[model samples]
Target: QPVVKSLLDSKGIHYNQGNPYNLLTPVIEKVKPGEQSFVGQHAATGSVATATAQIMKYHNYPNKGLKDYTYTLSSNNPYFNHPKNLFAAISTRQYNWNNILPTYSGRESNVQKMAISELMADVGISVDMDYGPSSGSAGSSRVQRALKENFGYNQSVHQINRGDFSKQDWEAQIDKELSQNQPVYYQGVGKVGGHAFVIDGADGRNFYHVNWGWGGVSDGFFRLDALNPSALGTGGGAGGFNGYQSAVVGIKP
Candidate 1:
């Protein structure tokens, strides 16, 4: 209950008290809280953000275990099925153009897929409280700021800084770092880092990073060393890593 309340407060959205069970249900299932140009709108940085918003709407809000949730693109599947549809949904919402959609071919598709996963997680399980669209540069400073400025995220939000590790042995270091409860986010192969994701857990052979799957096209997995070294710390753009490079996790204090 506290988790959901915190997320609601962080987003600066209001809710009415009822049976806690009902509150846990989907927003559509619950009574219409109010009316506006958009009744239940979602937001995100690019296609990933927008798709994520839709996923959250579909489940009517599930509880926890989102990490285990897999990808399924179907209107009947509870979220936006098509990537373009996700983009349209974002435009329909009030979020101004942060250039959230990718113009590049591969990057655009991947980012949109990620957005779907994110929205699903947000709408389903009550994990983090607030989310919004942000630029894919400098490892998501814009995302952090958006959370604090627009949402109610506090300074206590944990931040991990990364750099362009072109050195050969850095892979081992990354492996070690991620091994210690760290999720190493990768940008692209031979590119720069432009996004953020969480390092779930990994073996020395392959470091597994967990993201909403915006950049990787539907929130899939990647090998640590396979990511571009130069693109380790830039936006996933023309010369950037081109997708989810940063990660956010929720922990009880």
Candidate 2:
């Protein structure tokens, strides 16, 4: 069994094997296994949180956990002083339910995830929006904002046009970034439709190790080109194909 399966089974938490969203459902007191309730939908936020956690851990930030730190914002939460806790609080301060769930008919929808670019902005000065522009909007401008505001650091966002790149190209770029000890936020479609993950390492071959924000799904690895045709089809490459539309890389200062 995969490590995620073992972890969930041990917790006695039943989740739909087909639903990727259920992978990181919050474990707050009001929610529990066997009850039909959804806490905050935070897969994307969790992905950002997970990537931030790993980056902090790499810098020797104390009190790291195998699982990404997560919490409901409350005065009594024990992890209030934790780095991940503090970051999560800032990231979710403008939490928008419309991003996770469909709004009432005729309502405008908000961007679904906390953009890696937005978090990059928060590293220094604050950006005006709660969430950054919708995925793929603002493009490299988002990266430029971070690069300018976050002094003493180098960062870039690469937009991969599925048709122009190959498997080797994808792997090479990711390998180069991880080699610098940087974690990348990858946004793409897969068996679960559109979702984000943090790529922290590579297998030095076909697989790039990833942290799927769904709690116990940490350390999962996948190829750059692997595809689930049913979900969103594949971006054809030399051998397999890439499902990602873009990725953001942040290097330590």
Candidate 3:
């Protein structure tokens, strides 16, 4: 139940005491679960485009297979040479992979879950976009370069290194940011495994996410404070896979 009060306390975020939950209920109700693909078709596409253009402004979009020596991890996209186009494709694919039916019910509340696998893949997709096309050589190096160049992605790595965030701390922070209408990226605890999500805003009591899982129709919300790392798919690296955690960055508009 990632509700306002609990989440605020968990993350050490401040909020006034005037029935804040009431204010959030309506917003939560409005979230249409399983609409992520549609929402992302618009938002993610533009984001990737902006990032792609930024990449091109400074460098020659990498040549097919000549490892971009200057950018290190940058490489040509396998499907499309243009980084932006590849980003769009990846975004679409991510949405498709994580899409799930409306999983919860409430008059002004919706719940949609993203499998951990899909979330991490989107991170890879967005990261790859920034690496241009020469990135296939080493995935980790591309992650490093993308953080330096892509403003949209810069925080993911920075917070991990600086905060040394634990899974609990990460999720709590995400809840706080969502409550404040800030956008955050989702990844699991530690630097190794997790997924990526955009925390768009909060519906009075819950936090809604713009998810790229399943490529479409996967957008939804959760009881903002109700989620724990264990419940949100981060319970001791289930199934031999490192469990999911939260890694969020607030992108200023």
Candidate 4:
């Protein structure tokens, strides 16, 4: 437990063990307690930014820590003026207008998929987040593009494939990734339509530690199978017994 706490603290991840407004709160309430979650919410889309920030913190600037990188909604820092800039600052550890312009509302999709991809790249350029007018939500593919195309890294995408994976297999996969200290980006059905969160750790049994992107609400250990697919209605987003519709993990070459 001490080691786990240290790992999270070094990354400057905040904890909201139990908060009702947290997207994961209800999920955690159904399970045990003492699990930790981080607080922050720009949008469901911000999951990409939040995950990228932690990844970069783990890899690039390990010694610098998060003091300069952390921001609150009320923080006087100019970067919060735009969500894109805010995410970019968290990922790159730098603050600049070039990063903000492409992601600003009205000019690009507020969801900002491409902008996030660029921000993750070695050299990013401004671009639209929307693939098309009716383009739905962004998924593991964006995480693949950002790591492969931008950072020259590799990742593996695991799909639930309509309950193809057994619970044992799914648990083993998550445990393997967390053992390596890699965060997994998970997209699943929630109270809202499709939502995203990062799985940072697991107890190797019943619960997995999650970082829900909604301002650290109920950031903590949640049951491995806590999501209720029925809540999503017929043909709603996939979750529950299927596990995550998609789980993306960063890998090395």
Candidate 5:
């Protein structure tokens, strides 16, 4: 058996084992016109800005506090069946502002990057979009610091850092953070360069919800142990620490 599943059993951490979407809510869903959700990088500056924005929406930023809004499950979405779209639609209302729902490109949306840039900067944090792939480990640390300083986030607990890429560690970190209503910043590298996204939520089936900063087109629930192993040579290189895999759990704002 793979170390992921084996260690999971060893640690007695069993997640829901079904369609990751089912972990959030039912298939058919209905959503309000203005809810906070994922934001996309319309331009090619950096995904860190979009990811930071998405995380803000996940916590209902610039809106009412937690437990202020609610949602239901029913057939109501236009294009994708994923529930993230509905969540974003109701959370931030970025999609419903223009009266015409935007598609995947994010170029058509009225919620432009200029607005996002202003939004993040307002919080006293500077977003570095192109936080190099080699700096994956340091990058997560940098983001954690930014969120804590400006947005008043707590990163002391549930942080599954780089060089700590094990299923047991990942699940434990996610479990505690999820219980506290926090989304994880999953920063890591695959066979390619390093990148990051928001692990907003998870299912009972061991699949976590991924809000890829790509207009909700690639958003879904995925297995936590899906990383392809790559050796970590130096600090930030193709075969070094940032070139392999990493994640920062429990980045609550």
Candidate 6:
């Protein structure tokens, strides 16, 4: 049996045998700058915000994309007055694609994620992670709390795990959300650490594009039933897309 099949069968995690969505993601390199459609954490432990920022961008609310919820202001500082500023800021990278705008290598997304990281911390969604200092994260519920409290999402997020959502239903639900151009929050945890990202695309079947939060590196499509993350030297970590992971379906606003 395939490694994926073995794992899925042992865990009772359903493997999608046939294509349901039939979606295809363009090659990461094929997409030009300012259109990479991803944001990298760019910090030691900023995966939460990076993933959050990407979801907010995809959410694309006219007046409230990543805006302060007005509730958090009573207790914490707002990361960015506006999300577009977070997206429009610029910075260099350790690798190529530096100084680009609206996409890969632009520091705005990085700033956005970092500010989001601090925001998560302020909301008490962060914990001392196994990966080390600044590398802390909380459960999906806590993430939703941050979203509702900070970004004004009206409690429209739902969590899916092996215990609650059946493999078939989980996969189907994710496919449905993606079909509506909604990005799903993909979170993972292992013995050492946890990471977060967004599954922004699907192949109408078992494949989905993982918008990894590592400065646009190793962000691409892979089988949802069998995610095999490679050694991404981006230093953003690799708990996402594999091993003890779950999905958080988002909302329209």
The per-model lDDT (C-alpha) reads: 0.29, 0.33, 0.29, 0.37, 0.38, 0.40
> Residue by residue across 1-253, what tens digits does model 3's lDDT show?
3544322223222111011111211011111232321211111211222222112111212211112122211222222223333322222232221121112121222211231122222333445422211111122223334433432333433333213565455555655665554444443323223333344445554344444222223445532332222323321223432233334343332
- Give the candidate number with the greatest TM-score: 6
What TM-score number comes out for model 2?
A: 0.41
Query: Compared to the true structure, candidate 3 yields what TM-score?
Result: 0.34
- Cα lDDT tens digits, model 1, 116-198, are 33333322222221111112222334333322222223343233333444333445444444444433333232232233333
Runs of candidate 1 with Cα error greater than 4 angstroms are 1-139, 164-193, 196-206, 212-220, 228-237, 240-253
Candidate 1 least-lDDT 10 residues: 13-22
Q: What value does the lDDT take at residue 43 in candidate 1?
A: 24
lDDT tens digits, residue span 28-95, model 5: 22222443321221112223333443454454333321211222211333112434321212223232
The lDDT ranking, best first, is 6, 5, 4, 2, 3, 1
Candidate 1: deviation at residue 94, Å? 15
TM-score of 4: 0.48
lDDT of 4 by residue, 1-253 (tens): 2112223434554321111111211011111123223223221223433344334334442221122222122122122232322222323434222322221223444334332333332111101111110111333444444544334444353333213557677655655667777666555533222344566776545466666644545566644555432223222233443333555565333
Superior candidate under lDDT, 3 versus 4? 4
- Tell me the lDDT of model 1 at 79: 20
Q: What residue runs in model 2 are displaced by over 4 Å at the alpha carbon?
A: 1-152, 155-164, 189-194, 227-244
Which candidate, 2 or 6, has the higher TM-score?
6
Model 5 residue 188 CA deviation in Å? 0.7
Give the 10-residue window scoring lowest on summed lDDT in candidate 6. Answer: 17-26
